[PDB]
């Protein structure tokens, strides 16, 4: 499923990320936005045996686990294909957990070279939630 | 160790600088921001950690705001300057949507 | 631009009093309001941010809230590090402006 922008600042919001450990809503949509491009079933593999799924593109070495990744840690506790569902409660859910304080948005290396520094909330405005 | 200082010409086109220490330029915006003695805040415009600048809409045509990155500095230039603009001007970081940290300040008197 | 509107002005009051200071905003801000204090000759420091969080050191007798337009902040039973001025401003895309100051002092 691909999210329009304010479909999927309204759902983050339902599920509790605005301004969730001090990161105001557009962070998250921007986050989406570079990492799976709005798309639930975004799958991207990096050289490591890792490989990335859902709307927030959640780790298979050390978030989610998929049964295929080398030293896998699976700190979220859950299978990496239970994160590619239309509904991003999973997902969000585990981003909850991979981010404890104020730096934990680097988690996601696309926020960190391009939501941060930029206007996240102009991902948001206009939107009605 | 989040830190920023602004220098000025002191009496008076102007440019102040703000020096800052503790992050880098491209994760946070810079705002500008005056007080006339006695007076309250007024806000000036701020540039982006991706460079975007915005300003004040009644003082637009006369403020600019620069930044170099690698000298960890940024930049308010004001030109047809007026006695109006007598004030303590200030920087300050803003981390998503606060401005967290502020410079001490600069005052600026018009010659007048 | 969208403009803030504070009040009140000025305030007396004694320690261990409560206090409410209002801004309330031309257009919706969506939340993005923070209030900040300024004491006699020293540079404004945040206070709370995103209408109700505390900045961090912030003591929780410090609470703010409101909406859409109108927001508040409330000092229950205020202490002598508190008297000072304080000043909301919005953060609702550009230009960001702010209210006119309230000057909380001593009765």
């Known amino acids: 499923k691909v999210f329009g922008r304010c479909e999927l600042a309204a759902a983050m919001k339902r599920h509790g990320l605005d301004n969730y450990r001090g990161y105001s809503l557009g962070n998250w949509v921007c986050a989406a936005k570079f990492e799976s491009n709005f798309n639930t079933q975004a799958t991207n593999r990096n050289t490591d045996g890792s490989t990335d799924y859902g709307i927030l593109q959640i780790n298979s070495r050390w978030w989610c686990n998929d049964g295929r990744t080398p030293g896998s840690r699976n700190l979220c506790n859950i299978p990496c294909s239970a994160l590619l569902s239309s509904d991003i409660t999973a997902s969000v859910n585990c981003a909850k957990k991979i981010v404890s304080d104020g730096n934990g948005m680097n988690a996601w290396v696309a926020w960190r070279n391009r939501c941060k520094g930029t206007d996240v909330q102009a991902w948001i405005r206009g939107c009605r939630l | 160790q989040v830190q920023l200082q602004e220098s000025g010409p002191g009496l008076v086109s102007l440019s102040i600088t703000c020096t800052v220490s503790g992050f880098s330029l491209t994760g946070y915006g810079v705002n500008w921001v005056r007080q006339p003695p006695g007076k309250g805040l007024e806000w000036l415009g701020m540039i982006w950690g991706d460079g975007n600048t915005d300003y004040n809409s009644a003082l637009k045509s006369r403020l600019s705001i620069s930044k170099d990155n690698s000298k960890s500095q940024v930049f308010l230039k004001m030109n047809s300057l007026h006695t109006d603009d007598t004030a303590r001007y200030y920087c300050?970081?803003?981390?998503?949507?606060?401005?967290?940290?502020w410079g001490q300040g600069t005052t600026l008197t018009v010659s007048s | 631009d969208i403009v803030l509107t504070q009040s009140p002005a000025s305030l007396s009051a004694s320690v261990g009093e409560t206090v409410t200071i209002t801004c309330r905003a031309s257009?919706?801000?969506?939340?993005?309001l923070a209030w900040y204090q300024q004491k006699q000759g020293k540079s404004p420091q945040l206070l709370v941010y995103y209408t109700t969080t505390l900045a961090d050191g912030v003591p929780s007798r410090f609470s703010g809230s409101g909406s859409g337009t109108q927001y508040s902040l409330k000092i229950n039973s205020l202490q002598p590090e508190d008297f000072g001025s304080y000043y909301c401003?919005?953060?609702?895309?550009?230009?960001?402006?702010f209210g006119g100051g309230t000057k909380l002092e001593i009765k």
């Open positions: 401003q919005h953060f609702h895309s550009t230009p960001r402006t």
């Open positions: 257009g919706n801000i969506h939340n993005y």
């Open positions: 300050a970081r803003e981390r998503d949507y606060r401005l967290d940290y």
